Amino acid sequence: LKLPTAPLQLSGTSAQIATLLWQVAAKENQLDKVQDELYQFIELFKQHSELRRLATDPFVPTLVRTKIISSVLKDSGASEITKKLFEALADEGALSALLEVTVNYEELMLAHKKEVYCTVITAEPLDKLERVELTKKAEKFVDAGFKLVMQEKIDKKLLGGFVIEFSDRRVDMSTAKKVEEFNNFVNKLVLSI
């Protein structure tokens, strides 16, 4: 066959269902109908205690657990991706995997609108030109056609420059560390002469 490439490669057995769920929802152009139908089901477990009894209670028979789920999802225009997923997770008793699929469905979705989050920490609050010169620095730290959003915080422990935090890497072009990276270079070099 031929499925779309998932943007991220993820972990296993709950992140592995979510990347299969993303791939059949990218084939059907249902990447946001399936996503909010997950988000409805997250809310459906909070309100109904007998719906979450179909995911935690081990003494629910599997013939009950797949017939409550199918006869409840037969209408209301749910995606055929969704009501096939939910009878599959109810066949195996994996309905409690659903908080963990929804989290990994988000990370595949947010890497599909290449929107990457950010946090910029500066010394004092920015100008409108200090904002524009900074994204020109910062979209050279995302390696594709990605867009950075931003989040602006302040720290006068920095002496100007900035710290960009991407939640999996940071880049420190602040001059408070440029001082320390200068000092330790000349504290190493006078000991080499």
Binding site: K46, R52, L99
Partner: peptide, 29 residues
């Protein structure tokens, strides 16, 4: 928190995706 029962899943099958892929793929047009 009332959703905290579902935060940690454990499965009865190591090959759970091989059953899930046999029901999600024929949901495609």
């Amino acid at each position: 928190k009332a959703l905290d029962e579902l935060r940690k899943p454990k499965f009865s099958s190591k090959y759970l995706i091989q059953h899930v892929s046999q029901k999600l793929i024929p949901a495609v047009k």
